[PDB]
Design a protein around this motif. Structure first.
Motif, PDB file in Angstrom:
ATOM      1  N   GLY A 216      34.489  32.400  47.250  1.00 54.13           N
ATOM      2  CA  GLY A 216      36.112  32.742  47.367  1.00 54.13           C
ATOM      3  C   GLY A 216      36.046  34.469  47.702  1.00 54.13           C
ATOM      4  O   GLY A 216      37.052  34.693  47.522  1.00 54.13           O
ATOM      5  N   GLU A 217      35.160  34.974  47.892  1.00 45.13           N
ATOM      6  CA  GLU A 217      35.059  36.470  48.080  1.00 45.13           C
ATOM      7  C   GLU A 217      35.396  36.808  49.672  1.00 45.13           C
ATOM      8  O   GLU A 217      35.843  37.863  49.960  1.00 45.13           O
ATOM      9  CB  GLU A 217      34.108  37.342  47.736  1.00 45.13           C
ATOM     10  N   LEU A 218      35.209  35.837  50.601  1.00 50.62           N
ATOM     11  CA  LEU A 218      35.174  36.013  51.955  1.00 50.62           C
ATOM     12  C   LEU A 218      36.837  36.330  51.987  1.00 50.62           C
ATOM     13  O   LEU A 218      37.043  37.381  52.936  1.00 50.62           O
ATOM     14  CB  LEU A 218      35.153  34.690  52.762  1.00 50.62           C
ATOM     15  N   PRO A 225      42.894  33.751  55.026  1.00 52.29           N
ATOM     16  CA  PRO A 225      43.058  32.865  54.232  1.00 52.29           C
ATOM     17  C   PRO A 225      41.786  32.061  53.606  1.00 52.29           C
ATOM     18  O   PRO A 225      40.497  32.256  54.398  1.00 52.29           O
ATOM     19  CB  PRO A 225      43.854  31.932  55.020  1.00 52.29           C
ATOM     20  N   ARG A 226      41.825  31.146  52.688  1.00 49.51           N
ATOM     21  CA  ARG A 226      40.615  30.288  52.363  1.00 49.51           C
ATOM     22  C   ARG A 226      39.974  29.729  53.503  1.00 49.51           C
ATOM     23  O   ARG A 226      40.512  28.808  54.320  1.00 49.51           O
ATOM     24  CB  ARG A 226      41.066  29.231  51.459  1.00 49.51           C
ATOM     25  N   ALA A 227      38.630  30.005  53.743  1.00 49.80           N
ATOM     26  CA  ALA A 227      38.014  29.380  54.927  1.00 49.80           C
ATOM     27  C   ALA A 227      37.066  28.230  54.535  1.00 49.80           C
ATOM     28  O   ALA A 227      36.173  27.646  55.380  1.00 49.80           O
ATOM     29  CB  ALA A 227      37.101  30.495  55.278  1.00 49.80           C
ATOM     30  N   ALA A 228      37.354  27.775  53.428  1.00 51.55           N
ATOM     31  CA  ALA A 228      36.728  26.380  53.026  1.00 51.55           C
ATOM     32  C   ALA A 228      37.273  25.887  51.375  1.00 51.55           C
ATOM     33  O   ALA A 228      37.557  26.942  50.822  1.00 51.55           O
ATOM     34  CB  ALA A 228      35.208  26.531  53.011  1.00 51.55           C
TER      35      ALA A 228
END
Ligand SMILES: CCCN(CCC)c1ncnc2c1ncn2[C@@H]1O[C@@H]2COP(=O)(O)O[C@H]2[C@H]1O
Ligand SMILES: CCCN(CCC)c1ncnc2c1ncn2[C@@H]1O[C@@H]2COP(=O)(O)O[C@H]2[C@H]1O
Length: 264
Positions: A216-218, A225-228
């Motif tokens: 969740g650091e990406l 935004p959330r990449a996964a």
């Protein structure tokens, strides 16, 4: 003791007080007794666009939790202050002054009319700081064994646990959803986290995170935004922290990360 602070509230105030507090990482490890003492000491404080709720250099008086309204964060760089981030209708701030008896380390100002739930410092130090004593026991060794945290002054690594919060998740439970806006960094403490990816509709597995691994650091770095998505595989316990905390203490890690982020 009965020298406790109590601010009588209406059923509605408590309801809203309740919603506003549900996700505050600093309250994650409090037993029901401690939480109710906190809630009783919470007072409501309305704000207006432009209002300087906190001014850098000032004295630490209260801890705030956002009920509504937008805010901006300002820090002075050599005499010039810049918007180093902000809060949006949720979150908490003003804990550093009370935790570490230091001047306000920033300026918070409403960027729209808002509302806040404040907590005096006597109550805060009485319960939250006590609470940190407990958390330190539980996670001091652990945190001090995380490789990506080697790049931090022995002193800086100490203040990390002071602001992490424990989140429990059941099996199949979603931790984060791809696409969504991100405001938190996670570090698996127990259990397993399955990271998956989808495509523009309403799922390919790409990783598994075990105790000691972060995720969740990406989206915090890439300011994206959330990449996964992340899901709990069986009971999972993560030690989390908000972005402000992230950027405040983890700057010295962005490199070893930005690099190892190439492995994405
Ligand atoms: C975007 C993160 C910016 N950084 C790190 C830059 C040094 C921050 N660095 C220091 N304090 C911050 C930061 N962000 C929010 N506060 C909040 O603004 C509050 C100002 O009062 P405080 O010092 O008592 O506690 C502070 C935090 O809750
Ligand atoms: C080695 C697999 C690399 N890939 C797949 C490449 C497309 C990944 N590609 C994108 N995100 C990943 C990946 N692996 C873990 N995350 C984690 O899953 C998290 C999802 O939330 P985030 O985007 O905020 O930060 C992410 C990472 O910590």
């Amino acid at each position: 003791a009965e020298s406790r602070i109590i601010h009588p509230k209406t059923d509605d105030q408590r309801n809203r007080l309740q919603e506003a507090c549900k996700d505050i990482l600093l309250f994650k490890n409090l037993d029901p007794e401690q939480m109710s003492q906190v809630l009783d000491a919470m007072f409501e404080k309305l704000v207006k666009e432009g209002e300087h709720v906190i001014d850098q250099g000032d004295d630490g008086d209260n801890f705030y939790v956002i009920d509504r309204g937008t805010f901006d964060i300002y820090v002075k760089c050599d005499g010039v202050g810049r918007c180093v981030g902000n809060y949006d209708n949720r979150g908490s701030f003003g804990e550093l002054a009370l935790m570490y008896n230091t001047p306000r380390a920033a300026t918070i100002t409403a960027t729209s009319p808002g509302a806040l739930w404040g907590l005096d410092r006597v109550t805060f130090r009485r319960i939250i700081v006590k609470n940190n004593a407990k958390k330190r026991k539980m996670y001091e060794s652990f945190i001090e064994s995380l490789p990506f945290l080697k790049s931090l002054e022995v002193s800086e690594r100490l203040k990390v646990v002071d602001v992490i919060g424990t989140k429990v998740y059941n099996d199949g439970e979603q931790i984060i959803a791809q696409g969504d806006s991100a405001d938190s960094f996670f570090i698996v403490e127990s259990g397993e986290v399955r990271i998956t990816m989808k495509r523009k509709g309403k799922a390919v597995e790409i990783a598994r995170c075990l105790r000691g691994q972060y995720f969740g650091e990406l989206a915090l770095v890439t300011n994206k935004p959330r990449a996964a998505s992340a899901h709990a595989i069986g009971t999972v316990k993560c030690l989390a922290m908000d972005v402000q905390a992230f950027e405040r203490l983890l700057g010295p890690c962005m490199e070893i990360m930005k690099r190892n982020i190439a492995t994405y």
